[PDB]
């Protein structure tokens, strides 16, 4: 009913969105292959009223006329695709990425999703799957009597059987790189899918033209910096305070008009 | 919202960067051929509310006006390329450098990387490789029937075979020197790749125009000084706590302003 | 809308500016060659009302009439140009000034700034530059196959070549001194530009006319005294709280005036 109240409401909603993003970032600290998110805001419409640059008088113009702005709105939340610090879990099936590539998995629907988390297991049939049971492609089949699984820097998966001095190659782990890495649609479950803003999936060998190197026994932890989150929590709390105070001040003004 | 808050926020990030540098230096104490890092900081923006030297009057000039400054920013993290202490492992395959040279190794991609690590091993094919399996170039191969590998102070590699009353030469080991060793980009595995700030790699014999000498049976330990790391730990902890206290002071001032 | 509220606004602004000065000093504790700032405040206007000195009763003057004053405005921030503590880093490229001199650096746009930070680097062409890539004046050039760089206490630079037992002088490092060191305009990046309140640049070699002496392997740390900063926090907080209390009291007075 009054403009300042709508503007302050938009400010409150934006600050709540910022706090939601902060809480989501802090809730996924222990998640492997997680990237922290940051929201970016834009100011809302600007009421024209007096067009600046108009002729103030026959020989003079109006410098920077009367523009009344509306509130604020969030544009987008961008991920920070940076290499998190590696953690040694001493497991032959945990794989970490040193560069800028992704693992490809197949959803039950038949479509292909992409995940950076490398905590892998083996199913009852022998294929390498993720923690959610999704099959890593290209299919890597581990045979029944395996003694040790070796995954090299270039993505070759080898199995050393009993009594044979040579290792048997059973697959080849490739990495998919996208032109726009932040444009992927996150569906949860540490899974990102291709959108039209994320270019096209370019398959490549882990060590070639820009795919990262695969480390066995390592996991890529989240890149969330927690002290920054605490400081940003302080900032968000204070901003929400100030916006609520603006709402309360507008409430007090309308009261006097009602009393009139 | 408050400039003091932003300035403290930066200061906190700068001190966290210092802490991370110290932690990384301490984590690599026992690694051979390591160069400890050091961060350099610089002044951020300077708000010129009142210009220093402004002509306040036709006769008097304002000295040292209102130059309100912003926080701090780390210029870079430069590695200290100094000769670490030599240690005798007493192995024929261990080499150490005395001056400022680099060994050249070949990545699977075909490009050349540079290392100061001297722990060499022969592979199944007999070529000398580093601990990460990267082949030294220009390739030094060693035959199967070699009784002892002798690497001279000038880089001449020889072996004594059964019978052969004379030791045969199987190649020559050279060192690459750079104009600016600090600008080399570290990729891990004790490997540095050249950039445009590191000039060009100059190949030279170990004892010639300024490449260092080669000592056999010696290994170059890291140059990290533990006592300096602990003292810097204390100083960085105190500075970080004080910056956090500044953040708290700004928070309390904002709370008092809001409680109006 | 009421005088006391404007005066309290000015007081709040002054205390906030003091807080920015404190935060800027704190954020640059680890910055090499940093000088701490201090702000100076002055009284604002004084409304005349009854003129002090005007003759009442024909033969009796009026002493100390109604000089109702307005708030406070900060005059300027002045840097404390004192010698910071020297820290030994054992580097051939770190130079520390012990007296009252400045290094001259050329910005690529053509003009020259002045810096006290002595952490110098070598570009791919062999020139001595600042850590931000700015080429120090004069363009001391270092030969390719340098074994040791010696910067003497008189600013002379010597390089020890192989096969030459006598060092060869490759330059001369000078110090720039000013009439007024507080009048330099800080542009960030540890750089000062000359203003008309700082006189003109006086070149002098280190040891004569007053320029300081150059130490090799040492860095001039910041002169920020931190316990003083904490005590200044306590004041900058109470004073701000008290000014906010004055704002609140004026608000209550206006509220009762309105309500009647």
Report the first-to-last Cα separation within chain C, whole angstroms.
18
Residue partners of B252: CB distance under 8 A and separation at least 6:
C237
CB A220, CB A84: distance < 8 Å: yes
d(CA C235, CA B234): 27
Interchain proximity C236–B249, CB inside 8 Å? yes
- What's the distance, CA A77 to chain centroid? 8
DSSP secondary structure string for all residues of B38-74: EEEEEE--EEESS-TT--SSSS----S--EEE--EEE
| Angle between the N-to-C axes of helices B3-27 and A226-259, in degrees from 0 to 180, rounded to the nearest 10 | 160
Choose among C155, C154, C152, C150: nearest CA to C136. C155
Residues 135-164 of B with CB under 8 A from C: none
Written as one string, the DSSP assignment of B5-27 is HHHHHHHHHHHHHHHHHHHHHHH
Angle at the Cα of C24 from the Cα atoms of C184 and C104, rounded to 5 degrees: 30
Beta carbons within 8 Å of B189's beta carbon, 6+ residues apart: B115, B130, B132, B134
Question: Using N-to-C axis directions, what is the helix angle for B226-258 and C3-27, rounded to 10°?
Answer: 170
Give the resolution in Å: 3.3
State the Rg of chain A over Cα.
27
Q: How many CA within 13 A on the CB side of residue B237?
A: 7
The Cβ of residue A257 has, within 10 Å, a number of other Cβ atoms equal to 8
Instruction: Render the burial of B209-220: b for 16+ CB within 10 Å, e for the rest.
Output: ebbbbbbbbbbb
Half-sphere exposure of A164 (CA within 13 A, CB side): 13
The reply to whether residue B12 touches residue A98, judged by beta carbons under 8 angstroms, is no
Structural tokens at position A156: 């070759």
How far is the C-alpha of C174 from the C-alpha of C156, rounded, in Å?
Answer: 9
Residue recorded with tokens 């695969």: A214
Each residue of B153-187: b (16+ CB within 10 Å) or e?
eebbbbbbeeeeeeeeebbebbbbbbbbbbbbeee
Angle between helices B226-258 and C226-259 (to 10 degrees): 10
B88: Cβ–Cβ under 8 A, 6 or more apart, which residues? Answer: B217, B218
Structure tokens at A135: 């099959």
Q: Is B75 helix (H, G, I), strand (E, B) or coil?
A: strand
Please name which of A25, C234, A1, C219 lies closest in space to residue B249, comparing C-alpha atoms: C234
User: Which of C121, C118, C112, C80 lies closest to C97, judged by CA?
Assistant: C118
- Say if residue B152 is exposed, middle or buried (CB neighbours under 10 Å; 0-12, 13-18, 19+): middle
- Is A207 within 8 Å of B109 when comparing Cβ atoms? yes
Determine how β-strand C60-61 pairs with β-strand C55-56: antiparallel
Helix ranges (H only) for chain C are: 3-27, 226-259
Q: Is residue B60 less than 8 Å (CB to CB) from chain C?
A: no
Could you identify the residue written with the tokens 């206007």? C45
User: B77 and B37 in contact (C-beta within 8 Å)?
Assistant: yes
Residue in B78, B84, B107 with CA at minimum distance from that of residue B181? B78
Separation in Å, CA A184 to CA A135, A188, A197, A245: 20, 12, 7, 38
* Token couple for C66: 């109604």
* A window 224-243, beta carbon within 8 A of B: 225, 227-228, 231, 234-235, 238-239, 241-242
In A, minimum Cα distance to B241 occurs at A227
| Chain B positions in Cβ-Cβ contact with residue C187 (cut-off 8 Å) | 46
Question: What was the elucidation method?
Answer: cryo-EM
Q: Which two tokens stand for residue C83?
A: 């010698």
Give the relative orientation of helices C3-27 and C226-259 as an angle to the nearest 10 degrees: 160
CA distance B6 to B168: 68
Name the one residue in this structure whose structure tokens are 């890495």.
A181
Give SS3 for A71: coil
């Amino acid at each position: 009913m009054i403009s300042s109240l709508w503007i302050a409401k938009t400010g409150l909603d934006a600050q709540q969105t910022n706090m939601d993003v902060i809480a989501n970032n802090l809730a996924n600290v222990s998640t492997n292959g997680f990237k922290r998110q940051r929201a970016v805001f834009e100011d809302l419409l600007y009421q024209t009223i007096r067009q600046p640059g108009a002729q103030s008088s026959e020989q003079t113009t109006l410098p920077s006329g009367l523009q009344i702005g509306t509130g604020v709105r969030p544009v987008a939340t961008e991920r920070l695709h940076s290499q998190g610090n590696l953690s040694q879990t001493n497991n032959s099936k945990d794989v970490a990425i040193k560069g800028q590539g992704f693992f490809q998995v197949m959803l039950p629907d038949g479509t292909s999703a992409y995940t950076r988390d490398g905590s892998f297991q083996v199913d009852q049939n022998g294929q390498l799957v993720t923690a959610g049971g999704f099959q890593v492609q290209p299919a890597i089949t581990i045979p029944a009597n395996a003694l040790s699984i070796t995954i090299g820097r270039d993505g070759v998966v080898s199995v050393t059987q009993q009594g044979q001095a040579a290792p048997v190659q059973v697959g080849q782990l490739n990495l998919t790189t996208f032109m726009n890495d932040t444009g992927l649609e996150s569906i949860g479950e540490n899974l990102y899918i291709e959108t039209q803003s994320s270019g096209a999936p370019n398959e490549s060998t882990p060590g070639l033209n820009g795919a990262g190197l695969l480390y066995q026994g390592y996991v890529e932890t989240s890149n969330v910096n927690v002290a920054e989150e605490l400081v940003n929590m302080i900032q968000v709390q204070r901003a929400y305070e100030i916006n609520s105070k603006a709402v309360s001040t507008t409430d007090q003004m309308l009261q006097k008009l009602t009393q009139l």
